[PDB]
Design a protein around this ligand. Structure first.
Ligand SMILES: CN(CC[C@H](N)CC(=O)N[C@H]1C=C[C@H](n2ccc(O)nc2=O)O[C@@H]1C(=O)O)C(=N)N
Ligand SMILES: CN(CC[C@H](N)CC(=O)N[C@H]1C=C[C@H](n2ccc(O)nc2=O)O[C@@H]1C(=O)O)C(=N)N
Ligand SMILES: CN(CC[C@H](N)CC(=O)N[C@H]1C=C[C@H](n2ccc(O)nc2=O)O[C@@H]1C(=O)O)C(=N)N
Ligand SMILES: CN(CC[C@H](N)CC(=O)N[C@H]1C=C[C@H](n2ccc(O)nc2=O)O[C@@H]1C(=O)O)C(=N)N
Ligand SMILES: [Zn+2]
Ligand SMILES: [Zn+2]
Ligand SMILES: [Zn+2]
Ligand SMILES: [Zn+2]
Lengths: 121, 122, 126, 122
């Protein structure tokens, strides 16, 4: 990944580590816009489909007229590190930001940014 | 409404008015935390249940360690004004912020802050 | 409560008592069509918003070309009895079957059918 | 494609073709259980995440104590044929029926049954 993309990991990690330990708010996400800005968010757990952290980030970016997002990552609390977006997120990301990459762990546990279509054939 | 509650309407209105007209991003929301901070967000439309503006606000508040939220409102694009929270939002709000009020239009069309339970009556 | 409405309770109760005890599948629902038919369903728990039992009923009715539904009820496992529809279900029910009633417990814990609009005052509309 | 896989396509197709054309109810799904039954369903469109046809099938199978589902397909109205499950369905399917296959179109447009994990690659 680029150093710009590497900053997303730092930002999402700082976000989740900065809030009280919660079962409702347990994952942070950060995304990079095509114009260089970073947007963050935290998940909202609910059985009716409370948004994943990634979806909160999408709404936060949209609130800032961010336009295209080029990369996204999610980081779990309790030092869990990078978590791949769930299938719901993969679908919303493909549909609203088809040019986006997601940061996931490679075969060696190392961060890599992959095109959303690779995660949702 | 209280002065603070009125400010939520202004903030959410400014937020939705500021972004490109979109079918995907068409409602803004603003919520007040107990400490007086305001958090905003815009909906993300998706058939799988992309979050309402209110839920984006909840995640934005949580990201800032806002704690308990006391009031929330949603404002539609294209001068639609106050929109009540939908049923899913009411459930999430009740479960995560039971002390919260939502701003809705009363029977005379005037803004009123209503306890979340009163929006999910028995 | 009408005889037909009461049958919804019996049916949903039968359904939840006819499946293994599960944390994924823990509530049953039944609805009545204007054509007299009854449609059932159970919930599918998932954090991304797996459907409530009521929503599974809606898709089951739709698969049978049921048309308009007039009443719905949900019955919980662990002998919980009648469970009011959640906010999400209230919205979907109002939007897709605006004339529907939901069976809920009254003050004395007894079954009563109320109009969906009564369960969502000051509705989201534009 | 095996006999039972072709049969699921036929059952889902008959289901969607048998109901009035609707923007709310526009996709049917069918799934096979290991105990020798087939369950159908149609989608319920709603912005809060009304269930996909596949999720209606999952609740219909659950209502019948079906246990393990081994194959699923979705068929669109107006002669659209096979539709791949969306990302949310893939996630729910993986989590609740990890042994399931979904019928999708291959590169030639022909039906193929693929393990659910293949549809959510790393
Ligand atoms: C009954 N509960 C739920 C407790 C759950 N054990 C929390 C959980 O699993 N949360 C996960 C859901 C969203 C979430 N998530 C999942 C997928 C994705 O793409 N993005 C996310 O933010 O990660 C969370 C996590 O792993 O901690 C509460 N009291 N809140
Ligand atoms: C993307 N689309 C779908 C267009 C939909 N007709 C938009 C809509 O109704 N959106 C509503 C969903 C969320 C949303 N909302 C709804 C309820 C609620 O509690 N909060 C919200 O943010 O308001 C939106 C609105 O009214 O504009 C297309 N390209 N055709
Ligand atoms: C970690 N988990 C989740 C366990 C939950 N404690 C189950 C639950 O609360 N389920 C509720 C969600 C849907 C659901 N429901 C809720 C509202 C509504 O309107 N209809 C429903 O079917 O009722 C269920 C119930 O009360 O048993 C799993 N292993 N599955
Ligand atoms: C204006 N509208 C919405 C109309 C939409 N154009 C219908 C749609 O796209 N529906 C899709 C959603 C579910 C759905 N679906 C999608 C994915 C999946 O895995 N299973 C599904 O059943 O397929 C449907 C379809 O393709 O027709 C209403 N008031 N109803
Ligand atoms: Zn997700
Ligand atoms: Zn809502
Ligand atoms: Zn519900
Ligand atoms: Zn789906």
């Amino acid at each position: 990944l680029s150093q710009e993309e590497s900053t997303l990991i730092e930002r999402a990690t700082a976000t989740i580590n900065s809030i009280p330990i919660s079962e409702d708010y347990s994952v942070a996400s950060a995304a990079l816009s095509s114009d260089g800005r970073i947007f963050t968010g935290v998940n909202v757990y609910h059985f009716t489909g409370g948004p994943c952290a990634e979806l909160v980030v999408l709404g936060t970016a949209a609130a800032a007229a961010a336009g295209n997002l080029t990369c996204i990552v999610a980081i779990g609390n309790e030092n869990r590190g990078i978590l791949s977006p769930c299938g719901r997120c993969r679908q919303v990301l493909l549909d609203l930001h088809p040019g986006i990459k997601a940061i996931v762990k490679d075969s060696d546990g190392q961060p890599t940014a992959v095109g959303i279509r690779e995660l949702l054939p």
